[PDB]
Write a protein that binds this ligand. Structure first.
Ligand code: HEM
Ligand SMILES: [Ca+2]
Ligand SMILES: [Ca+2]
Length: 87
């Protein structure tokens, strides 16, 4: 039962009212979480509305962090956009 969002739509969620990003083709709503994120707000704000896979993977987030991330998944990138965005 995967819920899809287009890249066009995701790009709209780029601000303090609603911040989404993409990690490995999934869509995360970090609007609230970014106020708590141990890595700070601005790394996430810079990524809002787009893919942040590379950045996320480079840090070496802990297994508890990676598990926490799953709680913010709201859907996945629409199939029509999956050539634009690397998994
Ligand atoms: C939903 C996704 C995310 C969650 C739940 C999350 C969670 C956390 C947590 C709990 C830590 C503390 C260390 C650890 O446990 O690994 C952390 C640190 C960090 N995160 Fe994230 N993170 C997320 C996304 C990101 C993204 C997308 C970026 C980059 C654009 C990022 C950059 C950082 C950095 C730079 C730090 C290390 C801060 C330091 O101690 O210097 N995080 N994150
Ligand atoms: Ca805070
Ligand atoms: Ca703030």
């Amino acid at each position: 039962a995967v819920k899809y969002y287009t890249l066009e739509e995701i790009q709209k969620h780029n601000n303090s009212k609603s911040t989404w990003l993409i990690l490995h083709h999934k869509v995360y709503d970090l609007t609230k979480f970014l106020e708590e994120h141990p890595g700070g707000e601005e790394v996430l704000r810079e990524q809002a509305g787009g893919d942040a896979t590379e950045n996320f993977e480079d840090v070496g987030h802990s297994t508890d962090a990676r598990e926490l991330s799953k709680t913010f998944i709201i859907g996945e990138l629409h199939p029509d956009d999956r050539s634009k965005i690397a998994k």
